[PDB]
Amino acid sequence: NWEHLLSLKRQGDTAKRLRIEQLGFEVDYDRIIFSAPFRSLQDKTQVIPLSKTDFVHTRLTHSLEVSVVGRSLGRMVGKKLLEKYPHLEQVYGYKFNDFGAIVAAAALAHDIGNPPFGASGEKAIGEFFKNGYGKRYKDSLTAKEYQDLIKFEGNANGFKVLSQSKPGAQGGLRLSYATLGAFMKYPKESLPHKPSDHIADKKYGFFQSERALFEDVAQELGLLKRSTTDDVSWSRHPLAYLVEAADDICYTIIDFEDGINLGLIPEEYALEYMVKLVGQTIDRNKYNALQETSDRVSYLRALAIGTLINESVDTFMKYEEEILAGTFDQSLIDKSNYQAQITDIINLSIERIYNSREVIEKEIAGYEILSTLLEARCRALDNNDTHYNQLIQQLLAPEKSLYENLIQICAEVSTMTDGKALRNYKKIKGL
Amino acid sequence: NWEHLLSLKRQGDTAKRLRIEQLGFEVDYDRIIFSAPFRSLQDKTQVIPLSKTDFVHTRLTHSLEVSVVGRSLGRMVGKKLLEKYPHLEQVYGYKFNDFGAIVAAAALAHDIGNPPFGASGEKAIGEFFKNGYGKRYKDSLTAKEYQDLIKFEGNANGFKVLSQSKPGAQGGLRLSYATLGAFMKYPKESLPHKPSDHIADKKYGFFQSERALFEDVAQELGLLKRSTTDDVSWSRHPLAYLVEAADDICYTIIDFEDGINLGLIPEEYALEYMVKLVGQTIDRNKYNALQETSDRVSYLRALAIGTLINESVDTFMKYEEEILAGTFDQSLIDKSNYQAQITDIINLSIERIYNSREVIEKEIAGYEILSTLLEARCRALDNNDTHYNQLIQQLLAPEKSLYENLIQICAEVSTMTDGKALRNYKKIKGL
Ligand SMILES: Nc1nc2c(ncn2[C@H]2C[C@H](O)[C@@H](COP(=O)(O)OP(=O)(O)OP(=O)(O)O)O2)c(=O)[nH]1
Ligand SMILES: Nc1nc2c(ncn2[C@H]2C[C@H](O)[C@@H](COP(=O)(O)OP(=O)(O)OP(=O)(O)O)O2)c(=O)[nH]1
Ligand SMILES: [Mg+2]
Ligand SMILES: [Mg+2]
Ligand SMILES: [Mg+2]
Ligand SMILES: [Mg+2]
Ligand SMILES: [Mg+2]
Numbered sequence: 001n002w003e004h005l006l007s008l009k010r011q012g013d014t015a016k017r018l019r020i021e022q023l024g025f026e027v028d029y030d031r032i033i034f035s036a037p038f039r040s041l042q043d044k045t046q047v048i049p050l051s052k053t054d055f056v057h058t059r060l061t062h063s064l065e066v067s068v069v070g071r072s073l074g075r076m077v078g079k080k081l082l083e084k085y086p087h088l089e090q091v092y093g094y095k096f097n098d099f100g101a102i103v104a105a106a107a108l109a110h111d112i113g114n115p116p117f118g119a120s121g122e123k124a125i126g127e128f129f130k131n132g133y134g135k136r137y138k139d140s141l142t143a144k145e146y147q148d149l150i151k152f153e154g155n156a157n158g159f160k161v162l163s164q165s166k167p168g169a170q171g172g173l174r175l176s177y178a179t180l181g182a183f184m185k186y187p188k189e190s191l192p193h194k195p196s197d198h199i200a201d202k203k204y205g206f207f208q209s210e211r212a213l214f215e216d217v218a219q220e221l222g223l224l225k226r227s228t229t230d231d232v233s234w235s236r237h238p239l240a241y242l243v244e245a246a247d248d249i250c251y252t253i254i255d256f257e258d259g260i261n262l263g264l265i266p267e268e269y270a271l272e273y274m275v276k277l278v279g280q281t282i283d284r285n286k287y288n289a290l291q292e293t294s295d296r297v298s299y300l301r302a303l304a305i306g307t308l309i310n311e312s313v314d315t316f317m318k319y320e321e322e323i324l325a326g327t328f329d330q331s332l333i334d335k336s337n338y339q340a341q342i343t344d345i346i347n348l349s350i351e352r353i354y355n356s357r358e359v360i361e362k363e364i365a366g367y368e369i370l371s372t373l374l375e376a377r378c379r380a381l382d383n384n385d386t387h388y389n390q391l392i393q394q395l396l397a398p399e400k401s402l403y404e405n406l407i408q409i410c411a412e413v414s415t416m417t418d419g420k421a422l423r424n425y426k427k428i429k430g431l
Numbered sequence: 432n433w434e435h436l437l438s439l440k441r442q443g444d445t446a447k448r449l450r451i452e453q454l455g456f457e458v459d460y461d462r463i464i465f466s467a468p469f470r471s472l473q474d475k476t477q478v479i480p481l482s483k484t485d486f487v488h489t490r491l492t493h494s495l496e497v498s499v500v501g502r503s504l505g506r507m508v509g510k511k512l513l514e515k516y517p518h519l520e521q522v523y524g525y526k527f528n529d530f531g532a533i534v535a536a537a538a539l540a541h542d543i544g545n546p547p548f549g550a551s552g553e554k555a556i557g558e559f560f561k562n563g564y565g566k567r568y569k570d571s572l573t574a575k576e577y578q579d580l581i582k583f584e585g586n587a588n589g590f591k592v593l594s595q596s597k598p599g600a601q602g603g604l605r606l607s608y609a610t611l612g613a614f615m616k617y618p619k620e621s622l623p624h625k626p627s628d629h630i631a632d633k634k635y636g637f638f639q640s641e642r643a644l645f646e647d648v649a650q651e652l653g654l655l656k657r658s659t660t661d662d663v664s665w666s667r668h669p670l671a672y673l674v675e676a677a678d679d680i681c682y683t684i685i686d687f688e689d690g691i692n693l694g695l696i697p698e699e700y701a702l703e704y705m706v707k708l709v710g711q712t713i714d715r716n717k718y719n720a721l722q723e724t725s726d727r728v729s730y731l732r733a734l735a736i737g738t739l740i741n742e743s744v745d746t747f748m749k750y751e752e753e754i755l756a757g758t759f760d761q762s763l764i765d766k767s768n769y770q771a772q773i774t775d776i777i778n779l780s781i782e783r784i785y786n787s788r789e790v791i792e793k794e795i796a797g798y799e800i801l802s803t804l805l806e807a808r809c810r811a812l813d814n815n816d817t818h819y820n821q822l823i824q825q826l827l828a829p830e831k832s833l834y835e836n837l838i839q840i841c842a843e844v845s846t847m848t849d850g851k852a853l854r855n856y857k858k859i860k861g862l
């Protein structure tokens with residue numbers, strides 16, 4: 001039921017907010033814009049670590065583009081939905097801008113829990129507990145708590161950052177429940193690991209300490225259970241599909257364009273792989289009148305994004321009933337007519353950009369930096385009577401369980417930028 | 432007349448676009464988001480040069496906050512305007528979201544022409560032509576062209592960046608005429624210098640090479656002339672007042688908060704100067720329950736921004752007829768009840784932040800960097816037969832008049848970030 005999916009509740013509320021008596025979905029955008037975690041995204045790795053103030057993307061600019069594309073997708077889907085179910089507007093009072101606001105707010109914050117150095121950073125944080133110092137804690141934690149530690153993802157960290165309670169400020173940013181539902185793409189815990197081939201089962205979305213919180217949200221939105229066991233799991237919110245589609249479109253096209261502009265990909269491929277996407281709307285005279293690679297690739301990027309957005313809207317509207325029922329098992333991008341072109345673009349990006357020498361060098365350095373910082377924090381946690389551990393506490397982190405302390409350490413390491421992490425690493429070693 | 436101020440025309444159009452047959456004001460936001468000049472704002476100075484990846488603001492985050500505040504102001508003012516003039520909605524078909532879109536798009540791009548190192552950078556570029564090498568060109572240029580060169584501001588550079596014609600792409604970003612009108616705050620040329628004490632006469636808004644372009648815009652929007660001479664000048668677009676109010680509110684409050692968080696201002700002042708702004712809505716229990724300086728200053732900042740936004744809307748609605756007629760001479764912030772508090776905050780910021788030792792060091796370095804780069808470009812321009820000048824052209828800038836070439840050099844220097852400028856300066860000197 002769509003009347004329960006578009007909820008306006010906030011954490012710690014007793015009177016039900018109504019749409020007629022209102023806007024809730026724009027304050028979420030404003031609150032995310034003005035927060036420190038969002039501001040820390042300006043110097044976090046998207047693909048190339050330590051961007052050197054070049055023209056390449058960071059996490060912040062990527063999130064902004066995903067937000068624009070998500071607003072467009074949400075507006076179109078909301079128009080079609082309001083056409084399909086008239087009573088959503090004539091009784092409850094929902095307009096087609098609310099869907100755009102929800103998807104834009106969710107897409108702006110979709111990537112906020114990521115640590116420095118990107119995917120390699122998450123792998124390093126996991127390997128620290130798996131085959132490093134943190135291994136010593138394995139006997140002192142529940143299997144669900146250990147699987148949280150050794151398979152750390154930014155998806156759970158983002159939910160925690162968004163919904164963190166502190167003395168005097170309950171609920172953290174206190175976003176609406178619809179935004180939280182559209183933000184979550186893996187509504188399950190860390191065990192069991194990969195129970196099936198469903199798209200919503202690749203990873204997990206919340207930690208144990210936050211688990212209870214999500215239950216509340218999942219009760220309010222009327223999500224559909226899938227547990228059939230002692231481990232909880234729910235079905236996806238329908239707008240989470242749109243969030244994922246926007247994320248995928250943006251990074252797939254922009255990575256290719258950035259690689260072309262950097263000199264790692266020849267310009268010819270730009271027309272070898274993209275023409276079928278842009279052939280139906282390209283103006284040949286305008287394309288031929290341009291005189292630099294940047295203009296041509298920008299033109300192609302704009303046309304491709306438009307085409308993919310339209311196709312995604314059509315695909316979503318086709319399989320709406322299955323998504324509402326919970327039986328859909330793929331993403332909207334896998335039901336597309338240009339899957340071969342996307343696959344070729346991704347494979348070329350993997351061969352040329354992800355495995356380039358400079359990228360590998362930066363990832364190797366990031367492994368060492370993260371391991372050193374985590375080991376210092378953990379050793380200061382174990383013994384708190386020495387002078388050195390007091391100094392470490394004063395520099396890095398100015399009544400809890402062991403699991404809560406370890407989660408706090410992981411969270412505090414992941415709020416740093418690449419530059420701050422490198423500077424702290426050099427300071428620890430006195431260089 | 433408001434029907435002519437909200438124009439949807441784009442550069443190179445022959446058929447008049449109508450509001451009923453439509454959205455135009457959102458494509459402007461999307462186009463600015465995806466452009467390279469907007470992306471270069473992530474590493475440009477707001478107050479503290481070479482931010483060192485800290486929590487302090489850059490140009491990009493400042494522009495985002497100004498955009499949010501501008502959207503709020505525009506929505507409120509548009510609601511009241513549509514209440515005052517019913518025919519704006521029942522015949523033409525304008526909704527209260529269009530004003531918000533126009534003000535948000537104008538506020539997002541309000542600061543895009545700024546050079547590296549902020550105000551000191553503009554002063555250095557001017558001093559280069561005034562008392563440096565570029566002085567040699569004084570005899571070869573018209574007085575209006577020389578006053579453009581020696582009083583370079585980012586306001587004219589931003590208009591040029593927004594409306595730059597290139598082979599195969601006429602009109603640059605091709606934004607709507609309403610957005611261009613709301614973006615311009617000084618609709619006049621560089622001579623005469625400060626003819627009066629009007630707020631719209633402190634600086635100039637367009638260069639000579641772009642002058643003709645603005646005339647077209649000023650013809651379409653029905654702006655009111657003020658020349659009475661051979662030098663053209665027009666009255667302000669009414670929404671430019673809202674853009675300026677949002678810019679002022681944001682930087683005035685956030686500079687204070689950032690100085691407090693950095694350790695340059697004691698926390699006590701935070702309540703000595705802000706209470707009258709926040710005393711009517713502050714919750715004392717919530718304020719006392721917080722346990723860190725960051726939370727308290729963030730709470731105070733939010734409350735102050737809300738109060739100032741409401742007061743600005745009231746002030747604008749009071750003096751609407753004078754603004755439409757063109758007789759208003761001050762900003763909306765000078766007709767406020769909290770002018771003494773704002774003045775005290777600004778004076779404290781000047782004493783403590785602008786004149787701190789680190790800031791002065793960075794500005795002094797930026798002077799040398801900009802002078803070196805400009806001199807190299809100009810010398811390569813003068814003689815183009817030497818091997819060294821060919822190398823300089825190949826490194827820095829891979830049929831025009833002298834004035835056009837000098838303007839192009841100034842523009843190409845101002846597109847660089849602080850890091851890129853420093854790296855190029857070191858490369859020129861071989862360090
Ligand atoms: N350097 C590097 N970048 C990678 C690698 N794998 C992926 N990336 C980049 C490509 C994209 O810019 C970005 C994708 O991350 P996102 O968090 O946006 O989504 P992703 O689909 O990877 O995962 P998620 O939805 O979070 O489970 O990461 C890799 O092995 N190395
Ligand atoms: N470091 C430093 N920063 C300054 C100085 N004067 C102003 N600022 C900073 C304070 C604000 O963050 C920012 C204001 O620049 P904006 O371009 O936003 O507007 P402003 O009113 O200065 O001028 P405009 O409207 O462009 O004529 O510049 C100065 O002397 N030194
Ligand atoms: Mg992600
Ligand atoms: Mg993904
Ligand atoms: Mg992403
Ligand atoms: Mg400015
Ligand atoms: Mg100003």
Ligand SMILES: [Mg+2]
Pocket residue numbers: 493497541542678
């Ligand atoms: Mg500004």
